[PDB]
Symmetry: C3
Subunit: 296 residues, 3 copies
């Protein structure tokens, strides 16, 4: 047997098909079993319409055996394209072996696995091309467009392997494929899924700034398009046409890395924001608010 053929068959029982059907629509994706009690991690755009229209959409999970078991949504995060599902009273579950994305390096051979029983189901192969790469993603329905700090691969991520696992050569999940291929790192997926199981939601830091990307010889970074009122930004003293160069301890190259940098901050703690303002380098102090006050 081949190297990739063995690594793929080992995790095929850990990858499931997720279907959401109505009287007029049908959406399919891939999921990963990450817990023996029935917790299934997928991405948020696979199930989005079922969450925003729960009255008319029905989500079921289909296993490698062909078994079709109904599924309930535990929680979703459009800002990370992540979602946790629950099947109830299913035994002998082959749980995926979750790895550590901080141990992943450029050149490492990977497998992007989709659910074997899926319609357009695909299993592609490649290497890790980039680490900690901010990539822009579109929101499925009323869902927000977001940016994740991602693992890039030259293996193809498509509709047939999206939501499935990015797998190393030890058959461990290092990422969640999201549809020049990108995946959500597993260390991010473990942190987000842990909160979606416990609280049914996750809270992220907000500043109240909109940014456009700028790159020249004077100052390259994120240019402030609007400062919301009463926001942590306008209280800390950020004005419009400011060029952010570092949020906290992370430098900001464009508007996409700015979105990721805000979302690694701590809610309530003061954070330094360095900006270039009409040729003057100005460091400012802002305390990030929570995006969900009542769930915080």
């Amino acid at each position: 047997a081949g190297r990739f053929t063995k690594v793929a068959a080992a995790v095929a029982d850990s990858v499931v098909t997720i279907e959401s059907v109505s009287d007029q629509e049908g959406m399919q994706g891939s999921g990963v079993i990450v817990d023996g009690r029935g917790y299934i991690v997928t991405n948020n755009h696979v199930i989005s319409e079922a969450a925003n229209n729960p009255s008319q959409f029905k989500t079921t999970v289909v296993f490698n055996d062909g078994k079709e078991v109904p599924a309930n949504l535990v929680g979703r995060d459009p800002k990370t394209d992540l979602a946790v599902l629950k099947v109830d009273n299913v035994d002998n579950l082959t749980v995926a072996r979750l790895g550590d994305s901080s141990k992943v390096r450029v050149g490492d051979e990977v497998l992007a696995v989709g659910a074997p029983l899926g319609l357009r189901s695909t299993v592609t192969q490649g290497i890790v091309s980039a680490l900690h790469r901010p990539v822009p993603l579109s929101g499925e329905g009323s869902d927000t467009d977001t940016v994740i700090d991602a693992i890039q691969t030259d293996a193809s991520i498509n509709h047939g392997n999206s939501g499935g696992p990015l797998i190393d050569m030890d058959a461990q999940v290092i990422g969640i494929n999201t549809a020049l291929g990108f995946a959500i790192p597993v260390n991010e997926m473990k942190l987000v899924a842990n909160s979606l199981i416990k609280d049914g939601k996750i809270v992220h830091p907000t500043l109240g700034i909109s940014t456009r990307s700028v790159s020249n010889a004077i100052a390259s970074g994120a240019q402030v398009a609007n400062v919301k009122a009463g926001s942590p930004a306008q209280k800390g003293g950020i004005l419009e046409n400011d060029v952010i160069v570092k949020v906290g301890n992370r430098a900001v190259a464009d508007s996409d890395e700015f979105v990721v940098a805000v979302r690694q901050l701590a809610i309530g703690q003061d954070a330094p924001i360095e900006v270039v303002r009409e040729g003057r380098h100005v460091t400012l102090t802002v305390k990030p608010d929570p995006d969900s006050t009542l769930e915080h």
Copy 2:
């Protein structure tokens, strides 16, 4: 030497260039020598115009040695994108080693080889991403659009390796590349080519139904758009707006799998067709006709 470099050089003498020229046009493709007497398998869209306009198109085969030998068409199958060519009185032919596509699995390393002396000739590498995947194909000229049950690969199939072999790591032909890459399985190619050598044509089962794809919670499958008159379908009792869910022993997920499912049936034998009709599951009995009565 490398792994893929060795497997490729081993079959380079089995892959040939196929050119079809006129006073104003020129078409090129790749072929595979599958018989020592001079039988060359390619796909039908490489030679289509030469078959429909035989008066003005000339087909020649170019070997790895640079030798240009005239070629005659034995037979073609637009429904499988397959064609058999004949070069006459050529010696010391390196015949390709034909394999078994039922032994192929997901993750297996493959090589999509084009003719080495071709203009845009390409040799790509990848893995098998899906097996028994129905894929839609367009007909070259007056040729019919069709659907094959295919081997999917993340290796690129393009104009430079189309008609050439999909090759395993034992340097055996497992498929015929047809231009997210797809190939015709070799077990299908052996059955079709055997009939094109003997009879110069192959006969496929027809039912007389046109289908559109439908997917909802009531019934997902192939929805009947039209039932031809005097067809096996309307005699067996299929009506319009019916949703086919299984043809014979094969379930039908969409209109594309319906095309493949009809074409695996037996001509003249009664076959069960299960349909969902206004909420009622109805199994029906149809006897498939031959598409070519005089060649049957």
Copy 3:
């Protein structure tokens, strides 16, 4: 560690980021250190605007250490998409190991490496799909469109690895990536870069012909669209509507191989040009001029 992970890390210190910034623009690319004295080979379209607008563009080189050192342009060749840069007084430089592209074969595993600290920086993997393939390229600004005789790979060449090295499994540079991926062969890069360091420019042979591609049964090749006046062509006796089939010792399949064939000729020596003219095969004699008389 993995095979590709080891080969990549070995050359990461030899690949640098090249940025060109103005008051309103910023361009980034990848470069390769090929000399211990500070000579950096990239492609010409990365730096083009900085060369045509040197008054307003500033080019700097960023190393794997994060070190930013100013860079000066030694010379460029739009006809090969090649450029040589110079950093001054930089020590402990990890110079890339340059290989031999004539020893490269189809199926050989390759790595297309971009600068690790680049914004859209990518490292992709693939094989060599074709050798000595003429590929058309577009000129960046006032730069001329050209055709190179290239190494084709199924590894992706994009904005993040363009200008970086194509690397074999011995971690040797076999090509310069230029953005179905193509690279400039290293033997061509050694010849062009040697002349750009010494003379600051390279001289190529010119004939004065414009060609369009033609392919039929009478004569396939490059059809002469215009013959410039006083050119080597019209003196040697080439007329319009002529179909070139061989330039020197190289046959010509289309207009793209004609561009490459002229550029391998010797300046000043008589060369045979075979053409098909109204059904008559006519061999003609032309002496190629230099494109830069004062630098010749």
